[PDB]
Amino acid sequence: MEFVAKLFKFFADLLGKFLGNN
Amino acid sequence: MEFVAKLFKFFADLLGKFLGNN
Amino acid sequence: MEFVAKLFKFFADLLGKFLGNN
Amino acid sequence: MEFVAKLFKFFADLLGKFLGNN
Amino acid sequence: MEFVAKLFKFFADLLGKFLGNN
Amino acid sequence: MEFVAKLFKFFADLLGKFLGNN
Amino acid sequence: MEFVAKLFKFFADLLGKFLGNN
Amino acid sequence: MEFVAKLFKFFADLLGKFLGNN
Amino acid sequence: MEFVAKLFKFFADLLGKFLGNN
Amino acid sequence: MEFVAKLFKFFADLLGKFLGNN
Amino acid sequence: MEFVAKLFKFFADLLGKFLGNN
Amino acid sequence: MEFVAKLFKFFADLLGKFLGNN
Amino acid sequence: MEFVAKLFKFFADLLGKFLGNN
Amino acid sequence: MEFVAKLFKFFADLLGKFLGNN
Amino acid sequence: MEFVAKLFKFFADLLGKFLGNN
Amino acid sequence: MEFVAKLFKFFADLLGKFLGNN
Amino acid sequence: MEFVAKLFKFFADLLGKFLGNN
Amino acid sequence: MEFVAKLFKFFADLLGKFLGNN
């Protein structure tokens, strides 16, 4: 995975830890 | 997928996490 | 500004960052 | 699909997410 | 401006960004 | 399909999404 | 301006963008 | 079909969408 | 102006855009 | 069909859409 | 002007656009 | 049919649409 | 002017456009 | 600033750190 | 500053220590 | 694992020790 | 300073002792 | 294990002796 995608995914995952995905 | 499409899709997906698709 | 206009403007601005306006 | 068609379709789809197609 | 006019204008403007007006 | 026809059809279709065809 | 006139004018203007008026 | 005929038919069809043919 | 006159004038004007008046 | 006949027929048909033939 | 006269005049004028009056 | 006859017939037919033949 | 006279005059004028009066 | 706008701005800013704005 | 913003800023700052801001 | 990923993971793990993952 | 911030700062400072800040 | 990892682990373990891991 390209670095900008990895970086974007880190932050979206980090937010998902707080707000959930389900 | 071309970068502008990937970028557009990221933001539409991100909004969909808040407002839903169904 | 109404939300659909704001959303449309975000994406047109985002494309403009890549392709320019001048 | 040609770029202008793809761009037009993105925005018509984006509006359809708010206002529906049925 | 009425919504259908605003929508029509958005798309005509968007095309004008690619093909010009002058 | 020729571009002017495609463009005309896009806008007539877009109006039809609001006002219907039946 | 009545809606059918406005609609007719939109399409005649749109064609004029391609073929000109002068 | 010749262009002037196609153009004439577009506008007569467009009016028919509002006023009907039956 | 009565509607049939307006409609007739639209089409005669539209033809005049292609074939001229002078 | 010759152009003047086609043009005449268009307008007579257009009037017939409003006033009928039967 | 009475409608039949107006209709007759429209068609005579329309022919005059093609064949002239002088 | 000669043009003057065709022209005469058009106008006599056009009047007949209003006043009838029977 | 009486209608039959007006009708007669229309056709005599129409012929005069083709064959002249001088 | 509304949360979705703040979130969108974070990611557009983050991309701008890599690709620039000038 | 809200916790999610503080957390996001920590990680963006941490990356900036490696990749720079100028 | 690349160093920036390892560093990011350390801090996300450290926070998870306080706030949990379930 | 809140404990999680103090803990985060300790580790970022500790790394800075090895890799520097300038 | 690399020295910075060993050092980080020492301090995280030391804190875990006070605050626990379960």
Side-chain angles (χ1 to χ4, degrees):
Chain A
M1 190 172 280
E2 63 276 15
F3 190 69
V4 180
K6 292 159 44 157
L7 195 64
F8 272 40
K9 173 176 162 57
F10 174 77
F11 284 105
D13 290 340
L14 195 65
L15 190 55
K17 289 272 183 174
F18 288 89
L19 302 193
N21 295 284
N22 301 102
Chain B
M1 190 172 280
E2 63 276 15
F3 190 69
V4 180
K6 292 159 44 157
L7 195 64
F8 272 40
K9 173 176 162 57
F10 174 77
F11 284 105
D13 290 340
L14 195 65
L15 190 55
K17 289 272 183 174
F18 288 89
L19 302 193
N21 295 284
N22 301 102
Chain C
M1 190 172 280
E2 63 276 15
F3 190 69
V4 180
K6 292 159 44 157
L7 195 64
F8 272 40
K9 173 176 162 57
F10 174 77
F11 284 105
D13 290 340
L14 195 65
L15 190 55
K17 289 272 183 174
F18 288 89
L19 302 193
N21 295 284
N22 301 102
Chain D
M1 190 172 280
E2 63 276 15
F3 190 69
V4 180
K6 292 159 44 157
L7 195 64
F8 272 40
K9 173 176 162 57
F10 174 77
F11 284 105
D13 290 340
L14 195 65
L15 190 55
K17 289 272 183 174
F18 288 89
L19 302 193
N21 295 284
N22 301 102
Chain E
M1 190 172 280
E2 63 276 15
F3 190 69
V4 180
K6 292 159 44 157
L7 195 64
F8 272 40
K9 173 176 162 57
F10 174 77
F11 284 105
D13 290 340
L14 195 65
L15 190 55
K17 289 272 183 174
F18 288 89
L19 302 193
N21 295 284
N22 301 102
Chain F
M1 190 172 280
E2 63 276 15
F3 190 69
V4 180
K6 292 159 44 157
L7 195 64
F8 272 40
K9 173 176 162 57
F10 174 77
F11 284 105
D13 290 340
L14 195 65
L15 190 55
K17 289 272 183 174
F18 288 89
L19 302 193
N21 295 284
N22 301 102
Chain G
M1 190 172 280
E2 63 276 15
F3 190 69
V4 180
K6 292 159 44 157
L7 195 64
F8 272 40
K9 173 176 162 57
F10 174 77
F11 284 105
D13 290 340
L14 195 65
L15 190 55
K17 289 272 183 174
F18 288 89
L19 302 193
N21 295 284
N22 301 102
Chain H
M1 190 172 280
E2 63 276 15
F3 190 69
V4 180
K6 292 159 44 157
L7 195 64
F8 272 40
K9 173 176 162 57
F10 174 77
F11 284 105
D13 290 340
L14 195 65
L15 190 55
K17 289 272 183 174
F18 288 89
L19 302 193
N21 295 284
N22 301 102
Chain I
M1 190 172 280
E2 63 276 15
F3 190 69
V4 180
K6 292 159 44 157
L7 195 64
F8 272 40
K9 173 176 162 57
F10 174 77
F11 284 105
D13 290 340
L14 195 65
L15 190 55
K17 289 272 183 174
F18 288 89
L19 302 193
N21 295 284
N22 301 102
Chain J
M1 190 172 280
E2 63 276 15
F3 190 69
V4 180
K6 292 159 44 157
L7 195 64
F8 272 40
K9 173 176 162 57
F10 174 77
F11 284 105
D13 290 340
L14 195 65
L15 190 55
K17 289 272 183 174
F18 288 89
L19 302 193
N21 295 284
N22 301 102
Chain K
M1 190 172 280
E2 63 276 15
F3 190 69
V4 180
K6 292 159 44 157
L7 195 64
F8 272 40
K9 173 176 162 57
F10 174 77
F11 284 105
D13 290 340
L14 195 65
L15 190 55
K17 289 272 183 174
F18 288 89
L19 302 193
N21 295 284
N22 301 102
Chain L
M1 190 172 280
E2 63 276 15
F3 190 69
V4 180
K6 292 159 44 157
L7 195 64
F8 272 40
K9 173 176 162 57
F10 174 77
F11 284 105
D13 290 340
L14 195 65
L15 190 55
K17 289 272 183 174
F18 288 89
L19 302 193
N21 295 284
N22 301 102
Chain M
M1 190 172 280
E2 63 276 15
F3 190 69
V4 180
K6 292 159 44 157
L7 195 64
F8 272 40
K9 173 176 162 57
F10 174 77
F11 284 105
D13 290 340
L14 195 65
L15 190 55
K17 289 272 183 174
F18 288 89
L19 302 193
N21 295 284
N22 301 102
Chain N
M1 190 172 280
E2 63 276 15
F3 190 69
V4 180
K6 292 159 44 157
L7 195 64
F8 272 40
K9 173 176 162 57
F10 174 77
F11 284 105
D13 290 340
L14 195 65
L15 190 55
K17 289 272 183 174
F18 288 89
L19 302 193
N21 295 284
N22 301 102
Chain O
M1 190 172 280
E2 63 276 15
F3 190 69
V4 180
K6 292 159 44 157
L7 195 64
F8 272 40
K9 173 176 162 57
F10 174 77
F11 284 105
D13 290 340
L14 195 65
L15 190 55
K17 289 272 183 174
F18 288 89
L19 302 193
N21 295 284
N22 301 102
Chain P
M1 190 172 280
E2 63 276 15
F3 190 69
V4 180
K6 292 159 44 157
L7 195 64
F8 272 40
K9 173 176 162 57
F10 174 77
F11 284 105
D13 290 340
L14 195 65
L15 190 55
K17 289 272 183 174
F18 288 89
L19 302 193
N21 295 284
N22 301 102
Chain Q
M1 190 172 280
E2 63 276 15
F3 190 69
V4 180
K6 292 159 44 157
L7 195 64
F8 272 40
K9 173 176 162 57
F10 174 77
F11 284 105
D13 290 340
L14 195 65
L15 190 55
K17 289 272 183 174
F18 288 89
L19 302 193
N21 295 284
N22 301 102
Chain R
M1 190 172 280
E2 63 276 15
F3 190 69
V4 180
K6 292 159 44 157
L7 195 64
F8 272 40
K9 173 176 162 57
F10 174 77
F11 284 105
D13 290 340
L14 195 65
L15 190 55
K17 289 272 183 174
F18 288 89
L19 302 193
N21 295 284
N22 301 102

